[PDB]
Amino acid sequence: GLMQFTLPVRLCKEIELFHFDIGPFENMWPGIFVYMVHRSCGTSCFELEKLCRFIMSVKKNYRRVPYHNWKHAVTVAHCMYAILQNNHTLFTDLERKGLLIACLCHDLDHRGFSNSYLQKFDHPLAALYSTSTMEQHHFSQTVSILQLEGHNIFSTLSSSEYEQVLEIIRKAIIATDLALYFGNRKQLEEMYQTGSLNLNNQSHRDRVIGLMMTACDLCSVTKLWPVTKLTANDIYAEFWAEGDEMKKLGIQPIPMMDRDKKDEVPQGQLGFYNAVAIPCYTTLTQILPPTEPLLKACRDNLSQWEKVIRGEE
Ligand SMILES: Nc1ncc(OCC2CCCC2)cn1
Ligand SMILES: [Mg+2]
Ligand SMILES: [Zn+2]
Incomplete structure (x- = not known):
């Protein structure tokens, strides 16, 4: 185990930054x-x-x-x-x-x-x-791959540590369900503000890891504008395919998924930054101050989308 991975100089430096593009x-x-x-x-x-x-x-x-x-x-x-x-x-x-x-x-x-x-x-x-x-x-696919022969990367963990890590992974993966994020962030907001947030409380740790998972999952909105803007195309390529599949089932999709309403994309991103991203990174910065660069980059990208709407780019 004397084999280290090293990256070229630019990557070695930039990989430490929140806005690194791989x-x-x-x-x-x-x-x-x-x-x-x-x-x-x-x-x-x-x-x-x-x-x-x-x-x-x-x-x-x-x-x-x-x-x-x-x-x-x-x-x-x-x-x-x-x-x-x-x-x-x-x-x-x-x-x-x-x-x-x-x-x-x-x-x-x-x-x-x-x-x-x-x-x-x-x-x-x-x-x-x-x-x-x-x-x-x-999570089911994760456990399946972990159970393939020669794939159990947790082999040297004790039985109890193994159950613990698989429970961290399960809660972390379930927390990427954006439908669960709204309630989770609201509860963290209340706990931080009333001063009851306690990192020794396992149910509290769980919620904070949940918010981190949402934060990491949405991190396209926290990159430099050229990356955020180009990632938005891939995000919308999927949304529009899903909108097409809704129209095949005889259901008008939400406008964010309707490729006839591409004109409405910049205003849809505004709603998403205001309703999801800004609240997410705000609450995360409150609980974990050193994640502030994620909130700052998100605010910069919100400003860039406002500029798209005003026809300035
Ligand atoms: N940049 C960005 N990232 C994630 C997004 O998710 C949108 C949710 C609303 C319904 C579908 C999921 C949107 N915009
Ligand atoms: Mg997902
Ligand atoms: Zn994801």
Whole structure:
């Protein structure tokens, strides 16, 4: 285990920043993830042969969809890495191990369709899992890959630590269901403001990890404008495909998913930053002050979308 991963100078420096873009070279993404695990967790956290086999099976189980693909998995993992590196002492050994794996696995086998579309289509997964449909599926796929021979990266954990890490991963992946975020953020807002937020309270830790998962999952809105703007195209490529599939079931989709209403995109992003993103990063900055650069970048991107609307770009 004297084999370190190193990145070229520009990446070695920029990877520490919240707004890092992992770049268009797919073959560098595994090495970027291993680099992050080594610095975030330690060079001993995982057996490298097992980790590499885990990563390549996870990659194979992401689909070639415009947005919810392998690049998203690694991008979301990198956002978690930056949060963990700016909040060193706040998180246990198992949490750091668990959360980067949770982020890598959080959208496993995504087909580019919302929980709503599965329900309206009457997909088998909607019968198996009544709520957080895709998210229970992502966690199921995680456990499946973990159970493949030579893929159990948690092998050296005790039985109790193993149940703990798999519970961190399960709660973290379920928390990426945006329908759960609204209630979770509201509850964290109340607890921070009334002064009852207690990081020794496991149910409180769970909620804070939940908000971090939402924060990492939405992190396209916290990049530099050229990345945010170009990621928005991939996000909308999926929304519009889903809108088309709604129209095939004889259902008018919400306007955000209707490709006849592309003109309304900039105003839809405004609503989304105001309703979801800004509140998310505001509450996260309150609980974890060193994540402030995410809120700042989100506010900058909101300002850029206001400029699109005024015809200034
Ligand atoms: N930039 C961005 N990122 C995520 C978004 O999700 C939109 C939700 C509303 C219904 C579908 C999910 C939107 N815009
Ligand atoms: Mg998801
Ligand atoms: Zn995601």
